Design a protein around this ligand. Sequence first.
Ligand code: CU
Length: 229
Amino acid sequence: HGFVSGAVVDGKYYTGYLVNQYPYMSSPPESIGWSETATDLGFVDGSGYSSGDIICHKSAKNGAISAEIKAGGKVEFQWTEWPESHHGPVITYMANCNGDCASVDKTSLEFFKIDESGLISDSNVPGTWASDNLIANNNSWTVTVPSSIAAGNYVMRHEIIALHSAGNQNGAQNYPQCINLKVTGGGSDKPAGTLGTALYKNTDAGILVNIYQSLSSYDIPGPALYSGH
Ligand SMILES: [Cu+2]
């Protein structure tokens, strides 16, 4: 249980969608963070993987503004205090808005993976995951916008999948958080994108998984990190 309170985009801090505050305001500030209604700080599980909720979290609506970033620049995601029990991968996507991300139909967004991390060390079951690195780094995660992607407006979908109940069907807990980026400079790479509602199935190797028995390998779920980049 947690959410992204902010993002440092090419060195500039942007306040995210404060899901514990903005939903209760007469009129919340604009944010690069998408609004969403998981006001319990909860998750989308496998029962929701073909639902619109998996795209940018429960009933998500477009952030009204975007953060400019030179292609090649970094995004640092700031989470709330992530519970140690919520072991799992940290997966980050971009999708071209093909226009303004403020008015894109979230169900049209074609997500390509730009960063992924899973099981770091198996030594002491259930081991050290991306999510434990995130905790250790003051509950934050840094990714690169590839220097070679095409300039354009993109939703960056940042996600922790907690695997502590993933032993059972629909037990994995997805915590997607979307921000709006305006990528400048760049190259011409247009990686193959996947609809939010096609990213995961509840049978996937990295979704239906028992982290409490030693894993020889972990198969980070979702489409392939585009090898070009
Ligand atoms: Cu939780």
